[PDB]
Amino acid sequence: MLTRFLGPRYRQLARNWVPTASLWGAVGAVGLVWATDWRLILDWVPYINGKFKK
Amino acid sequence: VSASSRWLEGIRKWYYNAAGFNKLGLMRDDTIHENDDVKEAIRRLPENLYDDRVFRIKRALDLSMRQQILPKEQWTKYEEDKSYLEPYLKEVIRERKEREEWAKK
Amino acid sequence: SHTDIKVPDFSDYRRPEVLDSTKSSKESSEARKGFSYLVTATTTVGVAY
Amino acid sequence: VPPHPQDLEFTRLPNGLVIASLENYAPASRIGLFIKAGSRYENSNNLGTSHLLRLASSLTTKGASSFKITRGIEAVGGKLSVTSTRENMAYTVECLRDDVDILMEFLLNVTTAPEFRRWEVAALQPQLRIDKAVALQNPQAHVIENLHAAAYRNALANSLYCPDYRIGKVTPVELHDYVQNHFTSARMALIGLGVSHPVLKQVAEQFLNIRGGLGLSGAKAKYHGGEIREQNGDSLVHAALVAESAAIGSAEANAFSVLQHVLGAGPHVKRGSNATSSLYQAVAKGVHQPFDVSAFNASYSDSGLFGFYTISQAASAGDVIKAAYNQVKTIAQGNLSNPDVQAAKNKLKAGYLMSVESSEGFLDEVGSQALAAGSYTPPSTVLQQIDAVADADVINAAKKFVSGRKSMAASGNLGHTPFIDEL
Amino acid sequence: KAVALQNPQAHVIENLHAAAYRNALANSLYCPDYRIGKVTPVELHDYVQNHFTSARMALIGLGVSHPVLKQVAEQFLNIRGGLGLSGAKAKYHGGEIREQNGDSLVHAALVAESAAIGSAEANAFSVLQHVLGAGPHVKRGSNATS
Amino acid sequence: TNIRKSHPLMKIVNNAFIDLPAPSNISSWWNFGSLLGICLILQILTGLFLAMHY
Amino acid sequence: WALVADLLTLTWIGGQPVEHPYITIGQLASVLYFLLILVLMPTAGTIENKLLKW
Amino acid sequence: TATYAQALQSVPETQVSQLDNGLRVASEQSSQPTCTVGVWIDAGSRYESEKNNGAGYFVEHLAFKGTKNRPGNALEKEVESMGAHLNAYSTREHTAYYIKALSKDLPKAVELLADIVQNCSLEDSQIEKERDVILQELQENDTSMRDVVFNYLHATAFQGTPLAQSVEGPSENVRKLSRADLTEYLSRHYKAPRMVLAAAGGLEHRQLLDLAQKHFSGLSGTYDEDAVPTLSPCRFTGSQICHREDGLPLAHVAIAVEGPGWAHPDNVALQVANAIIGHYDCTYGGGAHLSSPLASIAATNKLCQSFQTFNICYADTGLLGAHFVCDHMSIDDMMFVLQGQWMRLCTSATESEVLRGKNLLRNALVSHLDGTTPVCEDIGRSLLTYGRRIPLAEWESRIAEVDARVVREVCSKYFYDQCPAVAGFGPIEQLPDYNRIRSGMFWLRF
Amino acid sequence: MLSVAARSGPFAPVLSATSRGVAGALRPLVQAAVPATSESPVLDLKRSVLCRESLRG
């Protein structure tokens, strides 16, 4: 019952949705970084930078 | 053939009796979970078997209600359990799976 | 007789980039959607804030 | 130059099956299986069985499921179709040449191995209602249906479309019995277009050796005559008036086919006055504006119907019919030119030739000939046969129409449409 | 119509008349299906004005008095002038209509032109009918004089 | 006609507590559905007279 | 019923100090909860089907 | 047996020559006893004004009613007596007059076409008869809901432009148009750089050219000069026209984006993608199990009585989409599903369906080109639009080139996030709002 | 001469997998679109005409 989903067309379907589903993670993460002000990742960022460290 | 497959048959017949749907007049296929394939097979059943199917299930839901059982004569025997659905179920599935292979290419 | 139907003139309403019957519209589309979409982007950006 | 053609190849098998192929060197292929199985071989107890059957052409066969027949054929851009007339059914199949073998398999499956499953057949019954509803939205369909009903007791009187009382009533046993009794070797022909003769002969010897329902084109249609009348208001009276002519492929048949072209089939010239049309000209002298007439010519195995078909305004119906009738009478009484006949001859000759220009048309005609006749008959000799119709044969055909116990169908506001009696 | 026509006899006698006459008697008791929804208030208006007139009419009363009826009639039923004559005149023609079915059973009627009502010849026919056989007389009877 | 069926509110109550086809058949193990509902409101109603005073 | 009586163990044991016997049975009952639901009850249902020729 | 590729190379070269004059004159020759000739003209409707719309229509009506050399029904009597058929059409872009004849009759055929296409007795008596005929034809046409919605769809998509117009013109022009008006248009348009004489069937091409110089010498004469224009581009708007009429039992809808037109390479990929979606009709056997998801769902959920894809195709522009007919309650579901097909195809076209696609096309093309009449028309149209006959092996190659990437690229270019022309007629309460139509031309997911 | 239909006259229906349901033969309409107010349907409870598999580059 897993099994159904494995084949040339599904391989094709996977690939056609790859740019999108990784552009969504890019949305997701930048989104998550901004909304919490994360520190670790945001120290790296060449304008954004001068809000804590001074 | 031999003397060992009638222990497997004996164990089968035991579990059957333990399952105890026969105590309410039911055949094995009366008791199948109605999923999508199963629903189609009930649909494909001819008028006589559907009509007997519904009466069986009406009987047992009635007993089941008044928390009773049938007399021991009128229980369904293991031998004699009529699997009327299976040929239809097999065929519905056979088709679903052909569909599923076509969907892959 | 259903042929007596012409569509009314919308020149008053048509954006400029779309004023010429003589020229394609496929061209200004980008800027036109671009423009209207920018507005919505900018809006969410602000809202987000 | 395009090349050397090929010739048609043609084989009677000793079980009575016919095979014909051309290799015209075409990018696509046409295989038809033509079967003496038309509505005429229905009886009182099973009417409409062959209609349901015509619709049933993609229900599950022994290895091929419905799903496959559909999906397999669409996968290659193929086509599968069935055409009943009152005499035959024709399963034809069309694809590019690289794909014959897959389409062949589906063909033989459809025609020799249908399962007609209970549930599939139940699901299909509503389609008779839709299918009929579409067809019958031509007034001509109703008329020609009632025409045949009126003309014959028998077998040709059966309709192309399932009687309303039968919709939902035609059983998988009836279809099973229909195929077993009519889809047999001696009732059959397998025509191929850009396949090879070996391949067809092989298919046929392997897959189409089926003996024994039935024989004979053979109820025999009994002509009877009489009239059917459908009150309406539709806008316009459609009426057909007809007498017994001549079986297909007799000489007398060709005389009728000439007489038709004397009198007038369809137009030739878009929005034309139809100046060489005897009937039209004749009605028009009497009748201001909107009408049509054409000569009507149906030939069967057994029998055939000739006369004419009028559309008019309801009040003008008698005038249109009575004009048209007299015009025929005028030919029967001997008023035909030589060149009048010659132009019909050209209209008919040119017409036949044009009907076989194309794959769909040629194939249908070769199929039709195989069953009718057991021959292929090349166009030069068709034209030879046309040419052998004397003027007096044409007169005598008109003479036959005029004196013959008549058959009539009409629909509309019929209160000015006459009665036979009154013609 | 649907109620009425659930007798097979209704269809038969309808087609019987259709077949027998060109004319007027061939018309059915029940509206043709194509006409349902198509018959207008002007058509009804014209029907009553042209047929419901004094010379086409009679007023019969049962335990009323003749004065009272004569009064009603002179007051309320002086309407002149559509039409005259029983008078299209039905033209007998003959021929046959045939409805394929399976219903259980063939209903068939077979008929020829007889005689107008109230002629002597009419009564001869009405006798010939009783020679040949109308309905039963005896519940579950062999119908021995039929 | 019967206003239990037609009236927009009562409709909801009718579809849920009145006319609702239920099995012929369902046992005492079925009753805990209502009893959760009873517990729910009884919690609310004793909760509130607590909160007046808490 | 094994699930229910395992749950009855687990209720008893949490009502109960974290100390010699007590620990390891509590540990085992823990495994058993997850084992019945994840592994053992699924396998029984497969076994039962095999016995019905289903 | 020969292969299919083998069979594509087999079809003879379509053979082009020109007169010293500008009449192109062209043949595909074959073994048939029977042929089709005549004249395809770069005249149109896209060519007429507003004043003088309906004109070419009005000529088509007059073209066959007599010449100076063949007065009254003389022409009719001639065509009929040799068993030939004579026929015509006018589109927005193209007029054709053609004879189906015996091949021995190719002398008289071309001769009559010459006479029609050059010597048209526009007799004042007759132009008065035909005005009533045409007004009748207009009343006829209003009842064809299908014929209407496409006229509407033209009217709204190309609002402003010559392409917005009907072929028949409006009532008022038919009523008013003069003898002068018509010979004006005739002088303007029926000149020889804008005609092909095509034939197809049992003819030699030499034989045809002889008949061209025999019967077409002097049109451009000497001539054209002065006042040839070409066509301007037509603006595509998109935009909705909604003709609400709850008295007609089924709705018609036609919805389209702008296409690129005749010349553009990427019509092949559009036609492939179109064929994937295809067409339905309630008399199609096999329902349920149809390949096309639109067709499948339409049939199972009775959504529909027909639909059809199209790629209508003008000079430098086009209408690309779909038409359907349905219950008043279905217009929404039908809209949804059609849009969803387009977008699935823009974003996530897969390889197999694209091959089905390609095959349906190869099958369509080859099936269509069967008969002298279809082939003659193809010579015909193609020469006016393309300048060559594009041979069958070419179209194959252009079909073969399309994969999934080609589809989802070429679909994206034309369909993704684009304003459509919409047209409705009938019980159309439930037709989506334009915004909501417009919003179905993109996915938030994508 | 033998094609019992396109001897050109009696009815031939045609069903399909793929294309659309057809009927036959001859009968006029045909010189009667031509004089006029002969409508008809084009498209109610129905089906499409000439139709399809019929095409282009």
Ligand SMILES: COC1=C(OC)C(=O)C(C/C=C(\C)CCC=C(C)C)=C(C)C1=O
């Ligand atoms: C026989 O079995 C039962 C059902 O199924 C057949 C029900 O549908 C309901 C309906 C639930 C009610 C009235 C209480 C729920 C309250 C809240 C606030 C959610 C009950 C009681 C029930 O016993």
